[PDB]
Each structure stands twice: as C-alpha cells, then as structure tokens.
RNA sequence: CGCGACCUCAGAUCAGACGUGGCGACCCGCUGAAUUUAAGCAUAUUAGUCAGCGGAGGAGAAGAAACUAACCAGGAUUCCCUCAGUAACGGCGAGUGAACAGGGAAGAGCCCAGCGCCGAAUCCCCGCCCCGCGGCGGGGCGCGGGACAUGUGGCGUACGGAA
RNA sequence: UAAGGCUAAAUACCGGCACGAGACCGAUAGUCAACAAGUACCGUAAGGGAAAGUUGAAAAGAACUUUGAAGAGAGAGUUCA
RNA sequence: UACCCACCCGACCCGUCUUGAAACACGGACCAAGGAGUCUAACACGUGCGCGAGUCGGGGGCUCGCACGAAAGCCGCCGUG
RNA sequence: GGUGGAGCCGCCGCAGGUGCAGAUCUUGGUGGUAGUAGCAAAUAUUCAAACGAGAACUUUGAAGGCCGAAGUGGAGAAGGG
RNA sequence: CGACUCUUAGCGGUGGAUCACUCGGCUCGUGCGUCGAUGAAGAACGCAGCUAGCUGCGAGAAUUAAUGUGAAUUGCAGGACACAUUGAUCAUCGACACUUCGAACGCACUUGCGGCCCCGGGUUCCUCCCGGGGCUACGCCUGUCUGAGCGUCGCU
C-alpha cells in the first residue's frame, strides 16, 4: 500500500519471515516426520491475512 | 497378577510411556546386569549403565567374549554405543552399531562418590528384605 | 456485469484486525468487532454454534496464568517458603 | 405489566402465541427493584426490601444492602453469612424475600411443582427415565 | 395403525426422552461410596450407636396402614417431662427429638416413654474428662465394652 | 567459570551490577562476532553470557526482595507484589479468626449442653 | 448407552445351577470330558486336610 | 546500526555515545521490512568512522 | 450580618477496602418457538424444551409446615424405590398427566425483627507498647477519632420465654 | 402460624485437573483431528473447514567404476530379505 | 471340473416401478473400498426354564484395594409392592 | 505351488455396527472417448554474432514493424505486498 | 508368423484394497473440584549457535534460583567442566521474573496525544529541553478533608 500503519508492516515482517524453507539439517533429526515446510505462501495464490 | 490399582496394565498406556519418558527415568531402563563375579562381590543384581562402564555383549549378532568399554548412551535412541562394537560403512568410515543395557553384561563398574552409595543402598535394601522373610 | 465486471471494483475495506480477538473483523464503519465484537465489554460467544465455542476457550490458548494454577494447587497452594537447604 | 418486545404486532407463529399488550412478567416488580439495586453496587450484597410510596406510573422500593467487607459485618458471627462467597447476588438467583415468592414455593397441597429443590428440578426429576443397570 | 387385539398404549415418549435418560452404571460403585460412609462414620464417633440416636416407636396414618409401627422422626416433647430427660440434654444423649408432635393418648405415650426408661438403663454414660463427677458410669461399666450398636437402636418389631 | 548462584548470593548488590554490567557489554561483543563470522567457539558462549546475566540478575532481585519484604513485615500497610497471592476466591475467604468466632449466646449452649461420649446396650 | 448391558436371573434358578455344576463336579466321565487331565488322582471329590488353608 | 524496535533517536544517541566513547552528530531511523529498526549514525567530523569500525569489531 | 448545631446534598488522583471478564456439565431467575404431533387444521403437543438472556459453587437450589392428614395418626430438605403411568385434562383426542400413605440413603437443627428486661452492656477507625505475623490476629495502654438515643451489646423467641 | 433469615449430609456433573477400565473402534473406522488439527485452504464475515499413519532391526540409507549436459541408468555395494 | 480354441442346438440387459419391459420408460462407463431394518419402553401371542396360590426385584442392606469385580454371594429383607 | 513376512485357526457356547451390483448411493482410483477437442482477438517478423551440452523462445548488433502522447509514454491511490 | 483385436495365460507398472501392527479415539467408572484488577480467560510480537512448523518460554524470553535426581547432552557443531564437583541432564517445583493488546485502566486507539509526582543530564528549578522512576479508567462501601442549601433550628 505505501502508507501502511506499523501494526500491518509488523505482521508482513512475520509472515516475511515464515516463508523460508527448513534447515536441511532437521531432516537428520533422531525422529522426523517433516520434509518440506507446507505452510508456504506465495503471494499472488493465498492472499495472505488481509 | 497386579493388584494396586493406581498402577496401569494397558497394552497401549505403558507402550506410552516407553518413547515419551524423560531422560530422568531412561537411566533405571537403560540398566543392564552385573557379571557372576560382581553381581557376588556386592550383592546387587543389576545397575543403571554408565558412559565408561566395561561391557560384554550377550545376545546380537556380534555376542563374544571381549570386554569393551561403552563410549555413549542414546538416551534418545535410548540404546548404547560401545567400543570394538562396530561396522563398516561403505567409504569404509566405521559407525558404531546400537545395543541395549538389557543385551549386555557389566564386567566392571565405573566407581565414584555417587555410584557407590547405591550399590550400598541396592545391596541393604536386598538383605533388608531377606532379613524381613526371616 | 453483476459478476466478473463486478468481481472487479473491490477495492476498499470493511474489516481489519480486531485488537480483542486477533481475527480479520473490526468494522471499520460500525466499529463493533462482530466475531468478539468489542466496545462490548463481554465476549460474544454464543450457545449458538457449539463449533465456534470450541475454537476459542480456555484450553486453545495458552494458559499462562491458568495452567500454573492447577500446577500450585495439586500439590497444595503454599508460598514464602524454599525447600530445606544443603 | 410487560408487553412482547417484537417488531409492531409481529409476533410470529400460532394464534395463541400472538398476543402483546396484556401479558405480565413472572417475577414482582419489588423483586426488579431489588434485582437493580444489587446490580448498581456490584460489591455490595442484596438483603431485602419495604415499600416507600406509589403513583399511577411507578413504585418506590426502598432496599437494604449490605457491604461484606465491613469488619463490622466480617467480625460479627450472625452477620457473616452473606459475606461467603455462595450468596454473590442473592437478588438475581431469586433468594430475596420478594425474589423466592415468583419461584412459587412453599411446603403442601399446592408448592407441588417445585417439590424437588425449585420449578426447574422438578421436572428434571419427573420427564427423565431411570433406566436402571439391571432392568 | 393399529392391527387387531393389542392395547392402546400411551406411551409417553414425544417429549424428549434421549437427551435426559440416567443409566445407571454408578450403582455399584455408589454402593461403595456408600459403604465407607457408613463405614468411616463408625470408625470416627467410635463407641456410639453406628445406626444412629434412639428414635421412638409410632403408627403409621392412613387406615390401612394402622396396625403397622415405625421408627418415627423423634421423641415427642410431652414424652420427655415424664421421662425425666431434659430436651436440650435427650439430644446430647443420642436421644431423636422431634418438637412436633401432638400426643394424643396415653397408650403410646406410656409404650414411648418405657423406651427412654430403656435406653438410660442400658447406657453408658462417656465422661466428660478421665477423672470426672456424677451421672457417668463407672470404669467396671466401661471397660467391659466398646461396643458399637450395630443395627438399628433397640430395633422396632411389630 | 559458571558464575554460579554459589558464590553471587553473599555479595554487596553494587559488585553484582558491575559484574552484570561486564557481562553485558561482553555479550553485545559477542553479537558483532555473529556477524562477523567469529568461531563456533565464540557462538556457544554467547548461550552461556545470555543465561550467567540471568544467574546474576536472579540473584540481584532475589536479595532485594528478601530484603524488602523484611521492611514491611510486621507492618500493617503493605504493598501488592509482597501481598499473599494465593486464588481470589482464596483472599476473599474468612479471616481465620471470622469463622471460627462463634456468638457468645452460641458458646453458652455449648458449654451447657456438650455431647458425650457413649456405647449402648450394656 | 442405554443399551440393556446386564441380565438378570432368578435366586432359584442360579441356585440350581450351582446345584449341576456340584453334581457334575463328581462323575469322572464328566469333569475328564473337560480335559481335566483326572487319570492318577485319587478320588474325584476331592477332599484335602485343613491344613491347606 | 539494528536498534531495538521501541528506540528514539535520542536514545540511540546517548546509546552510541555512552558505549564507543563517541559523539554522534545526527541519527536518521527506519524500519527494515522485517522489523528490525535500522539506524544509521552521522558522527561528528572531528571523528571518524573507519578507525570506531575496528574498535568495536566490524569491516 | 455574623458565628454555631443538625438535616439533606456535593466535590476530593483523600485513608483504607471492593465491584466489574471469563469459564460455563452440573447449578439458579426469566424468556421463550417452530419444525414436529394430532393423518388438515387453528384447539391441544414439541413444551417452559433451543436459542436468547440473566445468575452462582465444589456441588447448585431448599430447609425446620400458615405441612401432612382423617389414623388407633405423622413430623424440615433432597434423593432412590414405590404409589405409578394411577386421581384429572383434553375438537376427554394427541397427549397429557401428578400427588397422599410405606420402605430405604441420609439424616441436625436452628437463628432474626418486635414485647421487655438490662448507665450502649455495643460497635467501628486511629497512636504507643507486649506477644503473633506466606489465610492480619490477640494482649494491654492511651479526654486519639467516629456510629449509635430515628438505637448499638446480653437474655430471648414461641418446642415457650421472661420475671 | 405466614409478611424477617441460615444449614451439612446423602443429592447433580458431555466443562477442568488427575486417574482406572472395556463383549469398543480400529486409520474412507474411530472425535473434524494416531501426523504442522481445529492445522492447510475458502468466505469480506457469521462462519465454513480438509487430505495425510507403516523402510529396516541398523541408515548398515548405493562408497567406487562407468554411461550419460543433467534427469536417469549398468556394474558394484549394503542387507535374512 | 477349470484355459484357449473348435463346432452343433439354445439365446434380448440387469435392476425397478409396473394389467404388461429387450423397451423408442428411468438408474447403471469400470474397479476398489464404505453402505440401509438398528436400540429402548410399552403391549400382545407363541415358546424355553425356576418356583407354584405365589412368585418375584428392586431399590436398598450386609460381604473389597476387584486382577478376575464395577462381578458373585447372602438379607425376620422377601415384602414395605 | 509362490510371497509374505507375524501371528493364526477347529469344535461347544455365548456376543454383534454381519455377508452388496442397484440407491444421478459415499470416498479414492481408472478407462473408452484419445493421443481425440484444442494452444485463431491487437497487421511483424528477418539476419548475424554471443552465450551456452542443448537456441525459432535468452542477449547484443543490424534490418524491418507496431503503440503512437485521449500511448503499450513517464509518476502515484486503494488495493497489492 | 504379415499389422489390429480378443481370450487366456507368462511376466513390467498404477493404484493404492486386503491383511498385519498402532504413542489416537470412543465409551464407562473413581478421586479431586484449579480464575481476576496484586490485574484472568483470550489475542499480538518476539526469543535457539546453526530453527521454517508444532511445542516451550517472555527483553533473566527454547527460561530464572532451589531440591532430587543423579552423567550426559546430541542432526552437526561448540563447549565448561576438574563427573571427589547444586556436579551434565531431567523432574519437580517453593526461590525471582510477567514484551504488546485484553474486563485492558490517563484519553483514544493514529499507534497520538497528554496531565500530575519523583531521580540522572540540562538546569544548577530557569524552564524548557534531553534522560530516568510513581501515579491518572468507571462503580460503590467505611472512614477523612473541603464545601453548598431563603431545609430545620440555635446563639447574636
Ligand atoms: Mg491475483
Ligand atoms: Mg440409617
Ligand atoms: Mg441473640
Ligand atoms: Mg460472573
Ligand atoms: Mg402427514
Ligand atoms: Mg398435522
Ligand atoms: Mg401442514
Ligand atoms: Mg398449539
Ligand atoms: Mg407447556
Ligand atoms: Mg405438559
Ligand atoms: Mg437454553
Ligand atoms: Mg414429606
Ligand atoms: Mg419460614
Ligand atoms: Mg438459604
Ligand atoms: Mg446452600
Ligand atoms: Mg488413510
Ligand atoms: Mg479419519
Ligand atoms: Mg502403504
Ligand atoms: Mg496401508
Ligand atoms: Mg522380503
Ligand atoms: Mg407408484
Ligand atoms: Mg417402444
Ligand atoms: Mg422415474
Ligand atoms: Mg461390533
Ligand atoms: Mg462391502
Ligand atoms: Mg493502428
Ligand atoms: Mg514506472
Ligand atoms: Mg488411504
Ligand atoms: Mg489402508
Ligand atoms: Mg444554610
């Protein structure tokens, strides 16, 4: 938008930050059921919160 | 047959409480017993097993007669990881292999101010009972 | 042109987040929440749909006060006062 | 009296459903009384009530309340009854002296309903099977 | 629709019977819950009648029910001036006062009454301290039991 | 090297700030090696700095407080935190005196009329 | 829930049952026919000395 | 600099200055898209920038 | 053209308390249908039920008769069996439809106001000490406050009580 | 014997904590949910609201040669399999 | 007896509503898996067993931390109905 | 017979949420159609080199073209994030 | 034997039934019966050396001190320590802490605006200004202070 208020830049500062894959390292945990992040947005399909 | 109730019995309950318990409890599991030269000496039938205790295979496919030191505990495996026990990986990078306390054998204890004082307390509390039945 | 050309000119917002409920539902014109709704002092929750009760109660958070409580009290509720020393 | 709070006439349904301006409210209008009194000062706990005065429009109840957390009341026994926690509004529950007489209770020939604890728990007792274990 | 010879059946289940149906699999473990009640009740007031205080013979009301005799609620007062037993005390004693009732002839006064001359008689009096006054039966009267009275105080039998 | 609770608890509360204030500046440093690529040596420690503030804060707050609430004990008027925060129910129960008084009419019943003690039928 | 779970029986009857499983607690031919592996025991109403107790 | 997100600038100028014995000529704030609080630290010209860069660490 | 009691009534970021939301099976006030049923149908019923609303606690309400009865009488409450699916209600039709006695679980009883008796015998809040302080309490000592005479304490309350 | 008032006990409990069990269901069943379940997603919103358990015993999970831009293969190796 | 094939005779596609369906009536691409007379109360007759001018059943009691037990046993209860 | 890798059945009883082809039945999968419909609104591309395993589709150059300042030009709002 | 096709068979897939397991349900019992302005329930945001999610926690933020417990922890690092040591870890929890909304409390919800108290710098109360701490929401009870009234009087 460009004139946004802080209490909606610090939720896109969240779900900025929710996007990112997962560690390749937690794959090697002792007992994983995980091995792909699935809650991933991307923002033209899923159009965020708002 | 049990009886106190208060107690579970339940297929699925203690099937729980297996791989979910803490690693405060996982010690009294992970024991393992005292050879006959032991288990003689200081009265007590079996122990908590410790990082550098000294072990005998019993059971697995690699049982024998070689007395090695553990090296660590999966605690988390819960399972533990001893010294001449171990295979070859294929880039030849050896790996240990996992065993249990209860496939396994102490052949010597590794002492200390704590350990001690169980032994004794195990070893008073057998006798207490023997000395009650009488 | 009810649909599609009208699935068009969309621009402008009628709800918001709530500061209440964390929902996307203050009404920006009536300034009433309608999922708490908010000037309300007390909660809208409604004996109504038994569905959207069990979404948010005391258990579906996080019960920072509350859970301790049960915690103090199974074991007895006391205060000023440290177990024996070594 | 009370009149049916719907839209003009309006109220929807059967013809015997359908009335509006003659109707009375259950409770007595001394128990309302008492019912706003006790929900102005939340922290105070409702006893009982007289009659002051009337007119052709309204009615005067003037009402005893009572603060739990005057030591005077705390510390005196007899007294200490209202400060326990059960007795949180006595006037919205229908304990009050004006309060109980709308719940229509009594012992005899006629305070049959209401012969368990209250209307309500008669019938509980009265429209429930006991489907015995053993039949 | 009904089909040659039955009844004609009023059952009542047009209300709504399934939401508030009680079953009952608390029974046996109400029975229990029960039992140490009774049970631990015993236990605390230990030697004092399990059952509860003596409580009077009386007649049941209506006409068929006549020759039969119950434990009634309590003693009546009349009774009591009579018996010598002060009613304040008689409910100290274990002794049921009911204050409501009108005694109405001497037959069940007298046949009442004979039941308080009982009880004193085969009652032995606890005393306040160890080391105490009057009105207490003695430590021979006293150490010979501690004997809860199981079963109904002095069981009425018709 | 922990700086255990040990050896914190008997200390003068302005060498604790010192001691607190040479952690902190130690773990602001400990950020910049973050960044700055440091060593896995140094990104362990900044765990161990983060917690050994709190075994020093703990400690700062702990003796205050014992300390403050030595004031006011025995004192009539005092303040919320040190107040007994048991349940509010709880606080707004009866005294312990407000219970167990009984009315002096009620305590001359029970002083007349006692129950016994007694067995029956012998 | 209401489910009729448990049954019911007369004294009478579950006296008498009792009765024919006593009876047929004797008679080899029957208590064997269980494979009650009875062949080298004494005697088939078997009675011990108050000592087990 | 990030900065804690509640921060003023005269906050983060009598931060700066108590810390790295500075002194700060002006302060100039923003929010990264992120939430961390940039800000960016004009010190005086009497001193510089390149040298209070190996001091606390940084290059 | 004052000062002073009281009565009513304000203001205090006054000293000290407290109330408000939630939870909500169970609990209490009220409010309150229509599907549905009656082979329609509005009477009736669903059903004082759901929603609505209000209110509580470890349980809730009730409770020491303006009762029951017609006996040769019983004796607070609630609960279970039982009455009994009965007395009656109803385009007496669909349905509805309780109670009284007995047995049993449990079982405890009590308090006000007034009439009067008793130097308000009372109560509240300060200050100084003595004990007590992780449910704020005793003990004392203070011409330190104040309510209360439009009425505070004891006995007493109808089963008699006072004298 | 009203117009004032209190009260344990039995008595109720699909909400809570904490347990015990079953002629139970057994992953299109069983609660929507054995797992990132009231999650993903949809609707502006009230609200709606899923799918998805299993290597082996141990990752011992194909080192190395080789073909192939790479995906894939062939040998080889691991494995009781 | 079953697989393919060969021949000779027979021969319309099931389900359903239907006086009458191969229907120029409707359902039905195929396959896996799920899927529809259940429980309770009340009657009624038929039958099985106990006792019999009785007979019961509770609800209550007495006998358990149940392992089996939320069982079984027993009660002028036993008849207050 | 093979494969599979952990449990299973016979009789006498008792207990069921009990036997599918059907319900434009529920869920998941799969065909025929079928390698079928189709990838048609704005006149427009061509050459050379680079890069590259691989080039009609990228890039640079050259050439032909269009939008054609009421724009396919240059900036913003709400929305989008 | 040419191709297609059908049937059956021999094998390759696709699909995910069946079976076999099961840290989950469901049902039924028992014990207890757990909120809050000292500031709940509910939400927001943040916090790990490498961390997206769940979960756990709260600027002491993958916890705090303490007591047991008693050597691990671990996907990989890294570590102290002296494992003769509150001594690793875990459970307990009782010692301390409680970012932002919220009955949400100075007023509003922009995240702005203030008021009144203190303590730093500034001043040297000189006032800002800059820094820091405490208050300030409505109702109502007991008390206190200040009042109002041609209300009722009293004394003048
Ligand atoms: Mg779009
Ligand atoms: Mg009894
Ligand atoms: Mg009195
Ligand atoms: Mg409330
Ligand atoms: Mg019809
Ligand atoms: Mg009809
Ligand atoms: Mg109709
Ligand atoms: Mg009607
Ligand atoms: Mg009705
Ligand atoms: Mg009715
Ligand atoms: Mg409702
Ligand atoms: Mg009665
Ligand atoms: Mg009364
Ligand atoms: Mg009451
Ligand atoms: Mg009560
Ligand atoms: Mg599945
Ligand atoms: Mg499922
Ligand atoms: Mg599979
Ligand atoms: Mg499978
Ligand atoms: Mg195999
Ligand atoms: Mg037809
Ligand atoms: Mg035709
Ligand atoms: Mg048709
Ligand atoms: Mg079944
Ligand atoms: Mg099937
Ligand atoms: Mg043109
Ligand atoms: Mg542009
Ligand atoms: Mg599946
Ligand atoms: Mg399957
Ligand atoms: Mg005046």
Redesign the interface.
Known sequence: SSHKTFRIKRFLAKKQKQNRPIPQWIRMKTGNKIRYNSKRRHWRRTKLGL | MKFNPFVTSDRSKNRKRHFNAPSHIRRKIMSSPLSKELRQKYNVRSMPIRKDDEVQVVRGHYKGQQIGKVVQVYRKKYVIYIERVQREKANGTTVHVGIHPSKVVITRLKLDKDRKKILERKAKSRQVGKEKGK | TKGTSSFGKRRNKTH??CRRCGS?AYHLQKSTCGKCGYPAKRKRKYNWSAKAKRRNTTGTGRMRHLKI?YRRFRHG?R??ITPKPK | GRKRPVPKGATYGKPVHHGVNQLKFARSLQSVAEERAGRHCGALRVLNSYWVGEDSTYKFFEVILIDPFHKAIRRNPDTQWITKPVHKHREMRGLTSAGRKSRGLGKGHKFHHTIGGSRRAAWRRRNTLQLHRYR | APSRNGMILKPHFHKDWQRRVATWFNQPARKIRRRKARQAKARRIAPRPASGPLRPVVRCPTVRYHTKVRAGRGFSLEELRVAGIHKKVARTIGISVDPRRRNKCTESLQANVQRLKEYRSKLILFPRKPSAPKKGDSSAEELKLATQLTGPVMPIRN | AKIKARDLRGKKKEELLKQLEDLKVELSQLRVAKVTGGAASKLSKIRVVRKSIARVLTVINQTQKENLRKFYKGKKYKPLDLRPKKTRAMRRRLNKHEENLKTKKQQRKERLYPLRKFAVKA | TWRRWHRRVNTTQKRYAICSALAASALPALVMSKGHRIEEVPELPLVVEDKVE | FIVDVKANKHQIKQAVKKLYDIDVAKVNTLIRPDGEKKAYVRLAPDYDALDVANKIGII
């Open positions: 918001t987040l996307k409580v509720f205060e000023g």
